């Protein structure tokens, strides 16, 4: 026989996961973990299954960073260089995709008939959300805030929502948590959009993104077209970036955003309160996580 | 309430599938679904499950074109621009990853529990294949040709096998067709390597820096001449550099060496087919014509 | 004194007009001065003032080519390189702005006080035209075709009208020719849009990202397909992308739609001409041949 | 009728003037205004006409910045981003040209038979001056200082000279001021050339300009060709820029320049004195403006 | 000891001469060694020393191609890619400088003490030549044509003379051939200038910005037109710009002027040859055929 | 006669040497000079010949910088801009080559039958060393440390070795010094490789060089391929550069290097001691030069 099929080896696996291993060694904020833990105060998933869910969500989150950073044309990730800047675009892209499949083999280990539908519908919402955001970026067409919120619902829903639904599906109780979780994802994103601009310097302007405050500033005076024109230019320069910061303060767009985040956080606390009144323990950890996204 | 979640709309699906629909409408050889039918002479999968397997395999293949064209940095696909030169690399990449997911939602329609293990395990091979090839590319390390075929079995076999393993999961017959069908994916790829240089642009595997089959043979046949491998490093677009490499590769008798190997492999494919038939199987004309349309 | 001011010299004028002289010497259709004579059959402007109007219109037109070729980022002009690819974009732009001023010094020779209001008010239209077109380009916003013609009247009419309004200021006849002459500048532009794609490079309006007439029709005829408008975004130089768009634009029956519109417009131009003649005007052969050399 | 011609609208006008409005909102030095005002101590143009002259000169000056910055390939303008870096080259270029025409419609409002000839000959000198400067830049051919001074006479004459001549032509008195004004423009430019190099860092070297001190340094030792070669390179880098600063001090080119500016300022004060002796008030404001361009 | 020094190996020489071997194997006119033999009819250098002179001259010439192709930024050499587009500019440059040194080690085999003064003094001319040409290029300063020939004598004569001066150092005859042989290197270069434009790419001296002979004549024949010299500034690759310059250079009757000058120079070469022969020298057919193969 | 051959002129010579004159005016470390002087404590070359040797080695060293900086694609040289960044690549390249020939005319002045063979074999080793280093850089193939040391032996041998051999060949005594000198060159290079990374910021990573510590770090864990991938990217950015610094400390590669340099310096001091015991003066200056390359 001319062809003899060899076995996969630790060394080859080390190559394929090089960019994934790279990203997992940078220190980051434990966000996904704390949210899982604070919901487990209520769902009490068994330790063996909760570990599986926690591994799947860790893999999925990192592979998503490998691909987002490429699609968003990013420069830094958790303070260190973005992974395609070390390994090149192709290998980073392929490491992310390999990991999507590996996580599917992991979620098979729950042995739950409904698991794979939950995983599919979550990843469809993810891609759907990132899809609409790229469409607006690529066409210079500023969405409305309702439109943005629906998009981020799928984007920063997809993966929060996947974790909580895998948890719900492995737990005895039947309380529907995902409306709460979607609100928490939307808050988290609007807080991220703000911090990206007030804390590289304003990297969302480099990437051309119609983020939540950028939308308010563009719509609040459509006679002026300076900010939207800047987004088209995708500037690397700190003078243009600084100039747009200044224009966005002058439209009161950061006050507007702090304002919205207050309204949403109230809605979340009511939803949490209305849930404990129906026979769930008081959750401290979730109130704490909700203070952690604060401006 | 402040937030009111909306229903995904047909206009929005149109945007998400912009790149996918565009690639789908360019005409192609469609040699994947001819192979599938050729095998359905033996496994006799009912029509309503075959449509699903065809639909799933076609989706995955268009998806991996969207993505691999970005990865390999191609210029043309089926004589026309790569999707990302029209839609940009980000929307094209997301549309790819989108379709990978709709493919998984679709394979669930078989309602066969072996189906998910088969789908997952074949895509893992596809990535291992693509992964080792990019690795050899980016390190400027020429692999051996056993290493090359190992990689190619995973990569171009990965989704030939997906199609047949799914078919075997809907058939009751207890015969392993997979070794046959991998041998065929190798032949298909080695042909594609040869045809890339002697017949998607002038020699786009040179522009890509891909260590393809004849390039491998020509590099290793004389390692004291590093003209060929240094040309891969420069990823040339110039027709002058490409034509010189092609001429170097001729004087190494590499194109002959390739023609030679695919002939030994086609014989091995025929034997393998005749063995299957001598174990109570119909004589298969269509599979033999598939193997012959795979030639030069 | 330390500073002693010098006299501008013929060698220095040669440098300032380097780009202008270069463009002037490439042969052109010269359809502007044929239109001017065609109208002088009715208005009978004396020879010595007509030479000035011709000189002024020719200058302004070459000036706006120097400048608009930079703006639109063209590659060829009259089959030859754009002036700025030879002299650089700064000297070419200044030579343009220089000539705009010598044109104003020249229109003062008519010694007609209406002349300055006419000159200023037509250049303001030219800029409004060019301004709205660049705006639609740079925002990736497809205008409607009423919006398109409004823009085109200002832009390609702006300097047809300059030529005739100046002529009417030296004639005593009390007949408004301007509506006729704007209708003609529209036809001339819609022809130019069509000829840019079906006949200055292969489809340079695609490379420029210009929302031209048939491109507009093809984009709006099916807004669930964003292939065309995304191709404008990429400003392609590749012949492969340009040829695909051209092929997309065919299947929308846009080239037919254009041929159609210019036919309705040529009829409207003929009627308008015959009306003017039925009010005590000589029958004009030359204007009708101008309208026919404007066709496909 | 197939075609119906619409009217121009506030919105469309807002688009066309976007880059012009942008530049007018950045704070700058009130130079042109103060010079007009200090000459009005002598010419006493009527308020209604002086406002017209002041508007025309403001428009003309800003549109000239829109186009110079493009032609000079500039990065910053009054500390903020250059306008074609926000709006793109074409729209900025076209905004400048539209404004040249609008200002011509404005100078029509003086209703003066001689106004338009003054405006034409001023703008011809402007373009003539910038024309010769680009020619030297583009051909790597260092002019002589006499040649430079004639060029800047037209360049920074054209627009100073336009304002004072429009003023003279609207005033009762007949004293010829433009020889004084040309000297004041030359001083202003030589002072600008110095400050560009001693106060982005040395942007005249990025743009390849043969400025007044750069000329002295290149000619003072033509055996060395380092500085002229640097101009050909058009460097964005601060090491090359720093190196040329150092070479220019070693040829005593900044001392030479301070020297010239002293000689010229004397000539200006004598011209001002010789003018008051013939029956004009003592002008404080012009002596003050002349102290404002000091090194 | 910690450090143990190794012996240079044949595999390592192969890498160092990678670019040199590559250039050597492309076929060339080999007009240098035909000139050498033509002169050996008079000087009768023994075979074993002539082989060394040939070997040394061939090495230096290939070395200076490796290096000057980087300097001038060429695209093709002998119809094929420049070595640095394959090996990179650093290895190609080092291989050049390497061979310069092996050439010096080789000229030591003559064991002639005049040989080192001749070798050093001719390479110093080569650099002075290349140096003044780059200088005129990079300052955009057109030289005069006396300045041009002064430069060319150093540059293209520098290594014609090396070959003959070495030959005269092994012959006993007391006749100065060098003035003849420099005149011939000038003719060879002026031909090469003309053939670069009228016959290594379309007009690669335009793309390089080289002030070659006809370009010089055309620039200076009318200094109030700066189209030609501004085109040199842009170093155009576009065929459209190159073709326009070529057309400008025609209307200056520069190609005629060149044909003219090489005819006066060929006459001067013939006279010079006949004078040498009238001082007791064999009639030389081969040198006259060399001079005729140098023509258009 | 149509052609009249002119003479070379001071002015033309000034042009050709412009980039060479430029480099000689920047202040640098007197390394080559001090090593020559400290060996002359032993060889006592006559003043007239030692000056010739000292001129040849100065020329050769500077012309080598003109060409290395081009081949290594360098940005700074002795703190000031690299010479091809001022004069362009071609003129810098040609200035270096002209100077190689001029130095050959200089070494003719020793009038020594053996001089020119010494010069040839030294410059062959030079090119041979730089040749192998470019080969590894260009092929992403990490050498072994033995292989690196042989390469640097020829590279930083060639020119140290040329000076000492020209000296030996002009001196009465017959003690063979070049084994000592080769060790001193290897030390000097390993010290340079270290300082390039711990003192532009890490320019050896920009240039893709397999320097001594970079080799140890790549080989010490071939499972990880981050550092070698970075070399392929040739980064100008300080985040990637910083990230690789951090990875190299974590493999103890700088400790390893200090370690080696200690071992070699001992070997050198023994060689120096073993030489004085055979009837040579005690050399202070060479012990001092050996303390000057210290980490």
Q: What is d(CA E58, CA E50) in angstroms, rounded to the nearest whole number? A: 12
Q: How far is C255 from chain B (nearest CA, A)?
A: 22
Four-point Cα dihedral B70, B73, B76, B77, nearest 10 = -40
Q: What is d(CA A23, CA D159) in angstroms, rounded to the nearest whole number? A: 59
Angle of CA points D210, D211, D214, to nearest 5°: 80
Scanning the structure block, which residue is given the tokens 């003018």?
A: D275
Burial (CB < 10 A; 0-12, 13-18, 19+), residue E225, is middle
| Both structure tokens of A43 | 């769902």
Strands D76-77 and D80-81: antiparallel
Which of these, F271, F51, F288, F109, lies nearest to F176 by C-alpha position?
F271
Beta-carbon contacts of residue A250 (< 8 Å; ≥ 6 apart): none
Q: What is d(CA B92, CA F153) in angstroms, rounded to the nearest whole number? A: 52
Q: What is d(CA C275, CA F207) in angstroms, rounded to the nearest whole number? A: 78
| Both structure tokens of E261 | 């000058």
Scanning the structure block, which residue is given the tokens 């071609």?
A: F90
Other Cβ atoms within 10 Å of F179 Cβ, number = 12
- Ligand-binding annotation for A189, yes or no, is yes
| Both structure tokens of D71 | 């032609």
Q: How was this structure determined?
A: X-ray
Number of CB pairs, chain C paired with chain D, less than 8 A apart: 147
Question: Which residue numbers of F belong to the known binding site for dimethylallyl diphosphate?
Answer: 77, 155-156, 189, 196, 209
Burial (CB < 10 A; 0-12, 13-18, 19+), residue E296, is exposed
Q: What is d(CA D194, CA D254) in angstroms, rounded to the nearest whole number? A: 7
| Both structure tokens of A192 | 């991220």
- Nearest-10 crossing angle of helices D212-219, D238-250: 60
Is the distance from CB of B246 to CB of B203 less than 8 angstroms? yes
| Both structure tokens of A114 | 């409904």
Chains with 3 or more CB pairs under 8 A to chain D: A, C, E, F
| Both structure tokens of A154 | 């799928």
| Both structure tokens of B184 | 């065929």
Other Cβ atoms within 10 Å of F199 Cβ, number = 8
Beta-carbon contacts of residue D62 (< 8 Å; ≥ 6 apart): D20, D23, D24, D99
Residues across chain D: 295
Burial state string for B237-269 with b = 16 or more CB within 10 A and e = fewer than 16? eeeebbebbbebbeebebbebbbebbeebbebb
Burial state string for A98-136 with b = 16 or more CB within 10 A and e = fewer than 16? bbbbbbbebbbebebeebbebbbbbbbbbbbbbbbbbbb
| Both structure tokens of E76 | 């093709």
Which of these, E261, E251, E172, E245, lies nearest to E213 by C-alpha position?
E261
DSSP tag of F75: S
Tell me the three state secondary structure of residue C79.
coil
Mutate to test the interface with B, among F132, F135, F140 (most CBs of B within 10 A): F140
Q: What is d(CA B212, CA B252) in angstroms, rounded to the nearest whole number? A: 15
Which of these, E102, E37, E33, lies nearest to E66 by C-alpha position?
E102
* Consecutive H or E run containing A85: helix A84-87
Q: What is d(CA A204, CA A196) in angstroms, rounded to the nearest whole number? A: 7
The dihedral built from the CA positions of residue C69, C70, C72 and C76, taken in this order, carries a sign that is positive
Strands (E) located in chain B: 76-77, 80-81
This structure's resolution (angstroms)? 2.8
Is B5–A128 a contact, with Cβ atoms under 8 angstroms apart? Answer: no
Is A233–D85 a contact, with Cβ atoms under 8 angstroms apart? Answer: yes
Tell me the three state secondary structure of residue B79.
coil
Is E75–B227 a contact, with Cβ atoms under 8 angstroms apart? Answer: no
Is B230–E87 a contact, with Cβ atoms under 8 angstroms apart? Answer: yes
| Both structure tokens of C164 | 């005739």
**CA nearest to F243 within chain A:** A80
Q: What is d(CA F130, CA F157) in angstroms, rounded to the nearest whole number? A: 11
Which of these, C138, F81, F64, A114, lies nearest to D227 by C-alpha position?
F81
DSSP tag of F6: P
Scanning the structure block, which residue is given the tokens 């070659």?
A: E212
Which of these, E181, E173, E170, E175, lies nearest to E31 by C-alpha position?
E181
Scanning the structure block, which residue is given the tokens 């003959």?
A: E164
Q: What is d(CA F196, CA F201) in angstroms, rounded to the nearest whole number? A: 8
Q: Where are the alpha helices (DSSP H) in A115-234?
A: 115-139, 145-169, 178-197, 203-206, 212-219, 226-233
| Residues forming beta bridges with residue E249, ordered by sequence position | none
Mutate to test the interface with F, among B132, B135, B137, B139 (most CBs of F within 10 A): B139
Burial state string for A63-93 with b = 16 or more CB within 10 A and e = fewer than 16? bbbbbbbbbbebbebeebbbbbbbbbbbbbb
Is C80–E240 a contact, with Cβ atoms under 8 angstroms apart? Answer: yes
Strands B76-77 and B80-81: antiparallel
DSSP tag of D144: P
Tell me the three state secondary structure of residue C201.
coil
Is D86–A229 a contact, with Cβ atoms under 8 angstroms apart? Answer: yes
Q: What is d(CA C155, CA C153) in angstroms, rounded to the nearest whole number? A: 6
Q: Which of A14, A18, A81 sits opposite F240 (nearest CB)?
A: A81
Q: What is d(CA E179, CA E40) in angstroms, rounded to the nearest whole number? A: 16
Is the distance from CB of C288 to CB of C271 less than 8 angstroms? no
Number of CB pairs, chain B paired with chain C, less than 8 A apart: 27
Give one word for D211, left, alpha or beta, with left for phi > 0 and alpha for psi -120 to 50.
beta
Beta-carbon contacts of residue A156 (< 8 Å; ≥ 6 apart): A129, A185, A186, A188, A189
Chains with 3 or more CB pairs under 8 A to chain E: B, C, D, F
Tell me the three state secondary structure of residue F81.
strand
Burial (CB < 10 A; 0-12, 13-18, 19+), residue F20, is buried
* CA dist list (Å): F193 to B159, C216, F148, F159, F237: 49, 62, 12, 18, 20
| Both structure tokens of E160 | 């014609």
Q: What is d(CA F230, CA A100) in angstroms, rounded to the nearest whole number? A: 26
Q: How far is C259 from chain A (nearest CA, A)?
A: 30
Is the distance from CB of E218 to CB of E248 less than 8 angstroms? yes
Which of these, D34, D40, D36, lies nearest to D281 by C-alpha position?
D40
Half-sphere exposure of D154 (CA within 13 A, CB side): 22
- Contact residues, chain A, for B4 at CB < 8 Å: 146
């Amino acid at each position: 026989s001319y062809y003899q099929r060899s076995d996969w080896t630790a060394d080859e696996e080390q190559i394929l996961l090089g960019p994934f291993d790279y990203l997992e060694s940078l220190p980051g904020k434990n966000m996904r973990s704390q949210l899982i833990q604070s919901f487990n105060t209520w769902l009490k998933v068994p330790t063996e299954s909760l570990d599986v869910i926690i591994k799947v969500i860790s893999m999925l989150h990192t592979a998503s960073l490998l691909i987002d950073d490429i699609q968003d044309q990013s420069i830094l990730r958790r303070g260190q260089p973005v992974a395609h800047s070390i390994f090149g675009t192709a290998q980073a892209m392929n490491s992310g995709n390999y990991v999507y499949f590996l996580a599917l083999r992991e979620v098979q280990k729950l042995q739950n008939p409904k698991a794979i539908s939950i995983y599919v519908d979550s990843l469809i919402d993810l891609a759907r959300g990132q899809g609409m955001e790229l469409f607006w970026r690529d066409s210079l067409m500023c969405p409305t805030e309702e439109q943005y919120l629906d998009m981020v619902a799928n984007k920063t829903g997809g993966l929060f929502c996947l974790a909580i639904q895998l948890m719900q599906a492995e737990a005895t109780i039947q309380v529907d948590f995902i409306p709460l979780v979607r609100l928490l994802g939307i808050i988290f994103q609007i807080c991220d959009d703000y911090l990206n601009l007030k804390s590289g310097l304003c990297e969302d302007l480099t990437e051309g993104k119609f983020s939540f405050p950028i939308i308010h500033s563009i719509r609040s005076n459509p006679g002026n077209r300076q900010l939207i024109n800047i987004l088209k230019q995708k500037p690397r320069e700190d003078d243009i970036k600084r100039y747009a910061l200044s224009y966005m303060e002058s439209t009161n767009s950061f006050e507007y955003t702090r304002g919205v985040v207050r309204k949403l956080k109230t809605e979340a606390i009511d939803t949490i309160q209305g849930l404990e009144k129906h026979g769930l323990e008081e959750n401290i950890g979730i109130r704490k996580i909700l203070a952690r996204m604060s401006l």
